């Protein structure tokens, strides 16, 4: 397909789910060939895997003493619609997470694409590769589209849940929500973390009940969520990607681990 940036600037606000500050977003249409990069206190922060500082319950990015917090959500929106030249300007430390889902971002940014000048150079897996961390999967092969499966065993009633995503179903994951267990709720809070998390914003279940009263999007919201990331995740290559992918129990950490692989078996 072709380049495409935004036709005009697009802002979006609101709390962070782990700062628990607000925080303002402003998109920037860009020219060819820029790529995909956060502005912030004067810095330019590049969304490729070189600038990834922390993996742990979000991918979070920095550059020169700028950090900005959770960037998969709004980097898996940007990925699916094939925006590859944009400036992400960030007033705050994080993206704000609205309700936990892409659908804000993508109903927004989806109406306003202006498409560029040249097509885009997409990063095409080469051969098959696995990376492993404590049990945890994902693997990666040659595919003219964008594939992504995740697996998902939780210990709850959930039990053993799988969804794929393809090319022209982009639909199906955008309105997954982030999700957290009752039970490693504390961990994240003692960890610094979680200080926006609410109903409002995220899925939350217990080994048997969920707290939301709205319920589920989805029986399998949760797997559509962790697809979703992945998507998020992989644009850390620097262009949008065409392969094949299979993640089981893959998280932040394990999808950096793959796409720095991946980065430097094609340099
Ligand atoms: O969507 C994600 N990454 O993009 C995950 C984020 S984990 C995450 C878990 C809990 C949080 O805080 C909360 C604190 C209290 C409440 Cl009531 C609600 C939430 C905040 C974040 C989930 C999928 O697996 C990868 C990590
Ligand atoms: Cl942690
Ligand atoms: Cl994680
Ligand atoms: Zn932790
Ligand atoms: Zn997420």
């Given at each position: 397909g072709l380049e495409k940036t935004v036709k005009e600037k697009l802002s979006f606000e609101g709390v962070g789910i782990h700062t628990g500050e607000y925080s303002k977003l402003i998109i920037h249409p860009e020219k060819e060939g820029t790529?995909?990069?956060?502005?912030?206190?004067?810095?330019?922060?590049?969304?490729?895997?070189?600038?990834?500082?922390?993996?742990?319950?979000?991918?979070?990015?920095?550059?020169?003493?700028?950090?900005?917090?959770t960037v998969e959500?709004?980097?898996?929106?940007?990925?699916?619609?094939?925006?590859?030249?944009?400036?992400?300007e960030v007033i705050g430390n994080e993206?704000?997470?609205?309700?936990?889902?892409?659908?804000?971002?993508?109903?927004?940014?989806?109406?306003?694409?202006?498409?560029?000048?040249?097509?885009?150079?997409?990063?095409?897996?080469?051969?098959?590769?696995?990376?492993?961390?404590?049990?945890?999967?994902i693997k990666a092969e040659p595919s003219d589209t964008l594939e992504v499966t995740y697996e998902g065993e939780f210990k709850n009633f959930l039990g053993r849940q799988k969804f794929t995503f393809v090319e022209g179903n982009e639909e199906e994951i955008v309105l997954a929500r982030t999700f957290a267990?009752?039970?490693?709720?504390?961990?994240?809070?003692?960890?610094?973390?979680?200080?926006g998390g609410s109903l409002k914003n995220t899925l939350v279940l217990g080994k048997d009940k969920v707290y939301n009263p709205e319920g589920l999007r989805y029986e399998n919201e949760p797997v559509r969520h962790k697809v979703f990331d992945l998507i998020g995740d992989l644009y850390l290559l620097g262009s949008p990607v065409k392969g094949k992918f299979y993640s089981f129990r893959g998280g932040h950490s394990l999808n950096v681990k793959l796409v720095?692989?991946?980065?430097?078996?094609?340099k």
């Open positions: 790529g995909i990069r956060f502005f912030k206190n004067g810095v330019y922060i590049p969304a490729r895997h070189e600038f990834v500082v922390h993996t742990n319950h979000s991918t979070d990015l920095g550059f020169k003493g700028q950090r900005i917090k959500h709004i980097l898996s929106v940007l990925h699916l619609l094939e925006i590859t030249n944009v400036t992400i993206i704000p997470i609205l309700d936990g889902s892409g659908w804000e971002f993508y109903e927004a940014i989806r109406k306003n694409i202006l498409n560029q000048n040249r097509e885009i150079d997409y990063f095409v897996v080469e051969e098959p590769i696995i990376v492993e961390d404590e049990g945890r999967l267990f009752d039970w490693e709720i504390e961990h994240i809070k003692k960890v610094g973390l979680g200080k720095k692989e991946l980065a430097k078996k094609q």
